[PDB]
Amino acid sequence: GSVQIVYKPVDLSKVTSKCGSLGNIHHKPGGGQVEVKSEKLDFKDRVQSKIGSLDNITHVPGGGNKKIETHKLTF
Amino acid sequence: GSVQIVYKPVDLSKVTSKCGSLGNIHHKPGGGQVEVKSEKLDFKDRVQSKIGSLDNITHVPGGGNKKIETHKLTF
Amino acid sequence: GSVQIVYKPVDLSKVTSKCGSLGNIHHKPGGGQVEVKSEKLDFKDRVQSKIGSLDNITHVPGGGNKKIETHKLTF
Amino acid sequence: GSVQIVYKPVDLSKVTSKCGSLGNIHHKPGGGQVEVKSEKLDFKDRVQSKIGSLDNITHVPGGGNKKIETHKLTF
Amino acid sequence: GSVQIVYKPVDLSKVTSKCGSLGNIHHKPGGGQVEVKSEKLDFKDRVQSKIGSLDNITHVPGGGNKKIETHKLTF
Amino acid sequence: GSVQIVYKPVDLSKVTSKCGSLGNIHHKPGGGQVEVKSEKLDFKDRVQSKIGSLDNITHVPGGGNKKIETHKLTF
Amino acid sequence: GSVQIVYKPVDLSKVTSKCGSLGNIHHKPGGGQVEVKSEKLDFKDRVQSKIGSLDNITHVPGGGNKKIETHKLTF
Amino acid sequence: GSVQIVYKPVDLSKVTSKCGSLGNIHHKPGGGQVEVKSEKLDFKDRVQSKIGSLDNITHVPGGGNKKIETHKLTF
Amino acid sequence: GSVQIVYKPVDLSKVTSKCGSLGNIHHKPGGGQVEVKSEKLDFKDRVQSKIGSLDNITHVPGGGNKKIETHKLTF
Amino acid sequence: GSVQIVYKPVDLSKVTSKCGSLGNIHHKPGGGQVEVKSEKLDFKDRVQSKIGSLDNITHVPGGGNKKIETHKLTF
Amino acid sequence: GSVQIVYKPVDLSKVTSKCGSLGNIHHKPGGGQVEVKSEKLDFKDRVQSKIGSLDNITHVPGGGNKKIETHKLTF
Amino acid sequence: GSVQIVYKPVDLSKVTSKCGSLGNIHHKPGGGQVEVKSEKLDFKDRVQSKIGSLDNITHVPGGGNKKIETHKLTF
Numbered sequence: 023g024s025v026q027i028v029y030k031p032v033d034l035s036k037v038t039s040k041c042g043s044l045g046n047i048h049h050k051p052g053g054g055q056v057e058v059k060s061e062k063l064d065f066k067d068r069v070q071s072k073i074g075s076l077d078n079i080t081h082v083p084g085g086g087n088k089k090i091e092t093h094k095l096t097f
Numbered sequence: 098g099s100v101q102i103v104y105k106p107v108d109l110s111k112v113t114s115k116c117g118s119l120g121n122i123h124h125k126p127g128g129g130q131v132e133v134k135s136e137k138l139d140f141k142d143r144v145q146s147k148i149g150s151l152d153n154i155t156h157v158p159g160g161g162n163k164k165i166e167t168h169k170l171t172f
Numbered sequence: 173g174s175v176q177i178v179y180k181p182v183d184l185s186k187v188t189s190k191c192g193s194l195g196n197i198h199h200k201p202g203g204g205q206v207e208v209k210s211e212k213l214d215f216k217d218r219v220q221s222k223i224g225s226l227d228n229i230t231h232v233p234g235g236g237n238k239k240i241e242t243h244k245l246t247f
Numbered sequence: 248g249s250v251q252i253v254y255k256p257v258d259l260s261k262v263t264s265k266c267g268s269l270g271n272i273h274h275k276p277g278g279g280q281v282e283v284k285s286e287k288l289d290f291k292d293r294v295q296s297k298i299g300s301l302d303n304i305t306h307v308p309g310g311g312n313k314k315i316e317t318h319k320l321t322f
Numbered sequence: 323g324s325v326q327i328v329y330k331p332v333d334l335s336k337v338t339s340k341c342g343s344l345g346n347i348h349h350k351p352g353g354g355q356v357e358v359k360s361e362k363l364d365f366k367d368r369v370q371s372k373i374g375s376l377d378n379i380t381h382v383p384g385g386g387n388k389k390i391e392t393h394k395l396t397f
Numbered sequence: 398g399s400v401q402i403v404y405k406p407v408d409l410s411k412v413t414s415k416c417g418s419l420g421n422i423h424h425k426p427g428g429g430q431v432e433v434k435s436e437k438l439d440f441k442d443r444v445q446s447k448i449g450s451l452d453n454i455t456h457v458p459g460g461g462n463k464k465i466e467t468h469k470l471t472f
Numbered sequence: 473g474s475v476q477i478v479y480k481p482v483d484l485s486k487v488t489s490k491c492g493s494l495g496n497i498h499h500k501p502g503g504g505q506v507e508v509k510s511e512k513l514d515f516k517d518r519v520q521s522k523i524g525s526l527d528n529i530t531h532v533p534g535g536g537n538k539k540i541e542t543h544k545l546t547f
Numbered sequence: 548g549s550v551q552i553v554y555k556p557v558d559l560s561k562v563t564s565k566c567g568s569l570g571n572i573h574h575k576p577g578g579g580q581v582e583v584k585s586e587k588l589d590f591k592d593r594v595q596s597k598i599g600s601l602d603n604i605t606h607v608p609g610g611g612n613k614k615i616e617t618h619k620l621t622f
Numbered sequence: 623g624s625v626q627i628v629y630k631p632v633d634l635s636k637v638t639s640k641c642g643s644l645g646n647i648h649h650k651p652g653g654g655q656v657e658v659k660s661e662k663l664d665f666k667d668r669v670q671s672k673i674g675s676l677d678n679i680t681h682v683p684g685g686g687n688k689k690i691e692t693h694k695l696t697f
Numbered sequence: 698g699s700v701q702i703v704y705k706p707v708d709l710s711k712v713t714s715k716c717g718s719l720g721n722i723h724h725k726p727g728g729g730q731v732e733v734k735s736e737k738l739d740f741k742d743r744v745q746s747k748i749g750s751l752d753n754i755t756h757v758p759g760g761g762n763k764k765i766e767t768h769k770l771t772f
Numbered sequence: 773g774s775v776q777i778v779y780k781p782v783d784l785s786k787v788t789s790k791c792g793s794l795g796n797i798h799h800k801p802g803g804g805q806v807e808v809k810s811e812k813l814d815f816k817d818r819v820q821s822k823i824g825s826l827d828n829i830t831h832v833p834g835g836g837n838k839k840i841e842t843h844k845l846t847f
Numbered sequence: 848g849s850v851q852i853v854y855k856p857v858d859l860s861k862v863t864s865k866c867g868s869l870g871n872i873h874h875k876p877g878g879g880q881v882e883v884k885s886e887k888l889d890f891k892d893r894v895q896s897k898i899g900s901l902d903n904i905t906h907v908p909g910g911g912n913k914k915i916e917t918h919k920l921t922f
Contacts, residue, residue: 026101029170035110035183037162043118043155051149053128055259055334060135069140072150079153084116084160095170100175104245107182112237114189118230120196126224127202130259136211144215152227160191161236171246184430251326260335266385268345268420278353289364296371299351299426307341307382307416311459314388318331318406320395326401338413341460344420354429365440374426374449382416383458389465393406396471443533443609476551484730484805484880485560491610493570493645503578503654513588515596524576524651525597532566532641533608533684543556543631545620551626559880560635566685569645576674579654588663590671599651600672607641609684616689618631621696655709700775708860710785716835721795726824727802734806738813740821749801750822754829757791761909765840768781768856772847773848780853783860791866792907796873801899803878813888821896824876828868828903835866836911843856847922 029095041085049076104170116160124151179245191235199226254320266310274301329395341385349376404470416460424451479545491535499526554620566610574601629695641685649676704770716760724751779845791835799826854920866910874901 051074065071126149140146201224215221276299290296351374365371426449440446501524515521576599590596651674665671726749740746801824815821876899890896 037112071146074149076151080155084157086161092167147225148223310341311386380455385416500575505580535566536611563638575650577652599674605680613688746821823898
């Protein structure tokens with residue numbers, strides 16, 4: 023008498039992660055038409071101002087891919 | 098007498114995550130038509146201001162992919 | 173006498189996650205037509221102001237994919 | 248006697264033209280769920296056919312911008 | 323006696339043309355789920371066919387911008 | 398007696414033309430999930446077929462910008 | 473007993489095909505009698521015109537002859 | 548007993564194909580009598596014109612002859 | 623007993639193909655009688671023209687003759 | 698005193714003669730289809746006969762062109 | 773005193789004669805299709821016959837061109 | 848005193864004659880398709896015949912061109 027065994031599992035799967043700011047930004051202040059223009063700014067004590075500025079702030083403690091796998095046969 | 102065994106599970110799945118700011122932004126203040134223009138700013142004491150500014154703030158814990166799998170055969 | 177066994181489950185599934193801000197933004201204050209214009213800002217004490225301004229705050233815990241699976245045969 | 252003349256017409260206009268195909272289309276045939284599917288096509292003699300398709304062709308004669316202007320002063 | 327003349331017409335205009343294929347199309351045939359799928363095709367004599375397809379062709383005469391201007395002063 | 402003349406027409410304009418194929422197409426045939434798939438194509442005599450395809454062709458006469466201008470002063 | 477067999481089908485045919493442009497055309501513009509003639513032609517901008525012309529273009533994939541024949545005797 | 552067989556099918560045929568441009572054209576512009584003649588042509592910008600011309604082009608993807616024949620005797 | 627077989631199929635046919643441009647054209651522009659003649663032609667910018675011309679081009683993918691024949695005798 | 702003479706008559710005429718039988722001849726008796734052919738003719742004594750025959754008889758005196766002309770100047 | 777003479781008549785005319793039969797002949801009797809052929813003719817005494825024949829008979833005196841001219845100047 | 852003479856008549860004319868038979872002949876009797884062939888003719892005493900024959904007979908006196916010209920100047 024006799025025995026015959028074949029053992030061969032297969033993994034062909036695929037996995038993706040994408041994280042953070044993935045978009046697009048278009049910013050354009052003051053693109054007008056004017057004949058005569060005049061601007062006068064006067065700032066004194068502990069003043070703060072932002073005029074036509076852009077701040078992009080991104081951080082990502084996230085995001086890993088992880089796998090644990092175990093195979094065994096005994097006879 | 099005889100015995101015959103074949104063991105082969107298969108994984109062909111696919112997995113995706115996308116996280117955070119995924120949109121698109123268009124910003125354009127003050128793009129007019131004017132003959133005569135005048136702007137006068139006078140700021141004195143502990144003043145804060147924003148004029149035409151863009152702030153994008155993004156953060157992302159998590160957003161990962163995790164798999165655990167275990168196989169055995171015994172005879 | 174004899175025995176004959178075949179063992180092969182299969183996974184062909186797919187999974188998707190999309191999380192956060194997904195829209196599109198269009199913002200455009202002050203794009204008019206005027207002959208004569210004058211603007212006059214006068215701030216003394218502890219003023220906070222925003223004339224036209226855009227900010228996007230996005231944050232996203234979780235949003236991930238998790239799978240656990242186990243197979244055994246005993247004969 | 249004396250004379251003083253000042254001559255200054257001004258143009259501050261804007262002009263735009265957009266021509267052709269600008270719209271939005273969504274088309275998605277046959278995207279179902281079924282256990283067993285079979286298809287059996289047999290086309291013999293001078294046959295014309297279309298299955299799940301879209302046609303886009305564009306001609307633009309027109310759509311330009313034109314201006315003519317004249318200025319005269321005689322003393 | 324005396325005379326003084328000042329002559330200064332001004333142009334501040336802007337002009338734009340966009341012509342042809344600018345829109346949005348989404349097309350996605352056959353994107354289903356099935357266990358068993360079979361297809362037999364048999365095309366014999368003077369056969370023309372389209373399956374799952376999209377056609378894009380563009381011609382643009384015109385779309386241009388043109389300006390003519392004349393200035394005269396005679397004393 | 399005396400005369401003084403000042404002559405200074407000014408042009409500050411801007412002009413744009415864009416012509417042809419600029420829009421968005423998304424095309425994706427056959428993107429499904431299946432366990433068993435078979436296809437059997439049998440074509441004979443004067444057969445023309447398109448399966449899953451996309452065609453792109455562009456011709457542009459015109460789209461140009463043209464300006465003519467003349468100035469004359471006579472004393 | 474006895475048998476005698478004679479087998480002789482006969483074909484004496486003729487077959488003809490003529491395809492495309494076979495007809496008769498007479499064209500003869502401007503063939504007159506005149507004492508004095510003068511012609512002034514002045515074309516500026518994006519003009520198309522025709523005077524006294526003839527167009528001949530021919531496509532023929534078709535028009536062939538085909539025959540299939542089979543003979544069998546079994547004793 | 549006895550047998551005699553005679554087997555002699557006969558083909559005496561003829562077959563013809565003629566394809567494309569076979570017809571008759573007569574063309575004769577301008578053929579007059581005149582004492583004084585003058586022609587003045589002034590063509591400036593993006594003009595196309597035809598005067599007294601003839602165009603001849605031919606494509607023939609087929610027009611062929613084909614025959615298939617089979618003979619069998621079995622005793 | 624006895625048997626006698628005679629086997630002799632015969633082919634005496636004829637086959638012809640002619641493809642392309644075979645017909646008759648007569649062309650004769652301008653063929654008059656005149657005492658005084660003048661022609662003045664003045665062409666500037668991106669102009670195309672034809673005067674009294676003839677164009678001839680031919681392509682032939684088809685037009686062949688094909689025969690297949692088989693004979694079998696078994697005793 | 699003085700005398701000034703110029704003498705120049707001009708001939709630009711054209712003349713044509715065409716005379717007789719103006720065609721081309723096509724003749725084809727007996728081109729039929731028949732299974733079995735037999736025809737019976739019995740002529741004894743001084744018979745004359747014509748069957749399917751063509752006689753073309755043409756003759757042309759004259760038909761020519763003649764011109765006679767004379768010039769003189771005397772002083 | 774003085775005398776000035778110029779003498780120059782001119783002939784630019786043209787003359788044509790065509791007479792008789794100049795055409796083309798096609799003759800083809802008896803080109804039919806027949807299985808079995810026989811014809812029976814019995815002619816005995818001083819018989820004349822024509823069957824399917826072509827006679828073309830042409831003759832042409834004259835048809836020529838003649839010109840006579842004379843010039844003189846006497847002083 | 849003085850005299851000035853110039854004497855120069857000019858001939859640029861042209862003359863054509865065509866007379867007789869100049870053509871092309873195609874003759875082809877008896878080119879048929881037949882399985883079995885026979886013809887029976889019995890002619891005895893002073894018989895004449897022609898069957899499918901071609902006779903072409905041409906003769907042409909004249910057809911020529913003649914010119915006579917004479918010039919003189921006397922002083």
